[PDB]
């Protein structure tokens, strides 16, 4: 055939891939963490947006740290051979490098490590997108007038 | 013959390292509101990093916090695109 | 209302 370029990911597999949305709104009373008013609007907005991009959206609400790890572990062990990509959206409280389950923190590295090129072979070479709505610390941006 | 195990990840963070990330009780978080709006408008016509750059501009320019506590009032937010991708990403393809 | 994560 003619000249071929390799500059863009192949996104015409039979499936676009999974879009896992972890929507943590209500936290265990034990933790002292406040409910995240407005996060259901986000979760619905994301579900509709990625539906129109032809992702298989799975919405999960109010997961413990153990359930987040088990979910990620299970999803990473699925056969993604027929899928172009993978998307995970995390909506929760957070700190730098950390997302909160309903009962305490999860290292983001623990979540993303399941999808490493050597650990999720049916996603090797495919884009793995992690969209993270959470704080990354306590600094405040005062802005500057333009 | 090998690729890095960390290659082909994209982390679309809602805020810069070290910073708070703001959320509205009625409209959702500033970042997710803006991400969804820009995907809806541009996913059939722009590469993903260029979509996310529009998200950065929308969050940066169109939002500012309102708080009864002066400590948290009139604050701004910039999201943070962290790309280990090795190729351009288009959500559409040629039929 | 604004409120953060």
């Amino acid at each position: 055939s003619g000249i071929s370029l390799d500059n863009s990911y192949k996104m015409d597999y039979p499936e676009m891939g999974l879009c896992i949305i972890i929507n943590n709104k209500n936290f265990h009373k034990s933790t002292g963490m406040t409910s995240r008013s407005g996060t259901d609007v986000d979760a619905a907005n994301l579900r509709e947006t990625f539906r129109n991009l032809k992702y298989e959206v799975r919405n999960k609400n109010d997961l413990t740290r153990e359930e987040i790890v088990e979910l990620m572990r299970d999803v990473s062990k699925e056969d993604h051979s027929k899928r172009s990509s993978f998307v995970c959206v995390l909506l929760s409280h957070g700190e730098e490098g950390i997302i909160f389950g309903t009962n305490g923190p999860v290292d983001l590295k623990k979540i993303t490590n399941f999808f490493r090129g050597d650990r999720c072979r049916s996603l090797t070479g495919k884009p793995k997108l992690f969209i993270i709505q959470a704080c990354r610390g306590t600094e405040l941006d005062c802005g500057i007038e333009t | 013959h090998k690729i890095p195990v960390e290659a082909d990840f994209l982390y679309a963070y809602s805020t810069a390292p070290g910073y708070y990330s703001w959320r509205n009780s009625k409209d959702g978080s500033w970042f997710i509101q803006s991400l969804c709006a820009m995907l809806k408008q541009y996913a059939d016509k722009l590469e993903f990093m260029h979509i996310l750059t529009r998200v950065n501009r929308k969050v940066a320019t169109e939002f500012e916090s309102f708080s009864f506590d002066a400590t948290f009032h009139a604050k701004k937010q910039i999201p943070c695109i962290v790309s280990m991708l090795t190729k351009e990403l288009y959500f559409y393809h040629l039929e | 209302x604004d409120x953060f994560x």
Side-chain angles (χ1 to χ4, degrees), chain A residues 1-28 30-69 71-144 146, chain B residues 1-25 27-39 41-93, chain C:
Chain A
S1 57
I3 296 162
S4 64
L5 306 183
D6 207 14
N7 296 325
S8 62
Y9 286 111
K10 170 179 170 74
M11 295 294 291
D12 66 337
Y13 285 85
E15 304 168 27
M16 285 291 282
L18 307 184
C19 174
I20 309 301
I21 299 168
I22 299 177
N23 178 41
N24 277 359
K25 183 179 192 192
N26 304 293
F27 297 75
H28 287 195
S30 47
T31 68
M33 287 188 273
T34 61
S35 297
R36 298 179 56 260
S37 303
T39 192
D40 293 343
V41 183
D42 277 0
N45 205 354
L46 288 156
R47 180 170 185 250
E48 178 62 15
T49 298
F50 281 93
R51 181 187 79 77
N52 284 133
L53 296 182
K54 316 298 176 173
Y55 281 84
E56 175 188 337
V57 178
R58 305 182 190 162
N59 283 78
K60 295 298 303 179
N61 295 315
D62 294 346
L63 300 187
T64 62
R65 61 198 303 242
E66 292 87 0
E67 288 167 334
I68 288 170
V69 166
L71 171 67
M72 295 294 103
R73 175 182 284 115
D74 291 348
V75 169
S76 76
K77 290 184 178 292
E78 292 186 19
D79 181 1
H80 300 260
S81 286
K82 299 330 180 76
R83 299 168 183 164
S84 301
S85 64
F86 174 70
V87 177
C88 176
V89 191
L90 304 171
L91 315 172
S92 199
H93 297 296
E95 317 190 75
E96 186 70 66
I98 289 163
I99 195 78
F100 279 85
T102 56
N103 65 334
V106 182
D107 284 357
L108 285 167
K109 205 70 185 171
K110 185 161 178 68
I111 291 163
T112 57
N113 275 351
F114 288 119
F115 299 89
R116 270 164 58 131
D118 61 339
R119 297 189 187 172
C120 182
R121 294 283 300 273
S122 56
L123 286 173
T124 309
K126 297 172 179 180
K128 298 165 271 286
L129 316 185
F130 289 81
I131 297 163
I132 307 175
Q133 169 53 46
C135 291
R136 302 177 70 185
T138 53
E139 292 189 70
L140 291 153
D141 196 312
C142 65
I144 177 70
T146 59
Chain B
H1 65 119
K2 296 197 295 194
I3 63 168
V5 305
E6 300 280 4
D8 302 310
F9 285 79
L10 181 289
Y11 311 84
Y13 292 103
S14 65
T15 197
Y19 281 85
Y20 288 110
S21 185
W22 289 91
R23 170 168 41 75
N24 184 274
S25 62
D27 309 321
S29 68
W30 301 353
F31 174 64
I32 295 298
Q33 288 181 58
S34 303
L35 174 64
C36 289
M38 295 299 94
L39 284 167
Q41 182 170 8
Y42 295 112
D44 65 348
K45 46 187 85 86
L46 286 180
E47 199 274 330
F48 190 37
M49 312 283 296
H50 291 175
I51 299 178
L52 289 176
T53 300
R54 308 283 197 115
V55 174
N56 280 2
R57 187 159 78 251
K58 186 172 174 67
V59 172
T61 60
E62 293 178 12
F63 296 85
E64 184 177 311
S65 74
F66 180 84
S67 182
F68 296 143
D69 183 347
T71 303
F72 298 104
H73 176 64
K75 301 307 181 191
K76 301 289 295 182
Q77 186 172 318
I78 184 71
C80 178
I81 304 159
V82 178
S83 179
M84 285 76 144
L85 299 184
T86 59
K87 295 179 180 168
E88 289 169 23
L89 199 165
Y90 301 87
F91 294 102
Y92 62 94
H93 66 273
Chain C
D2 300 324
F4 39 67

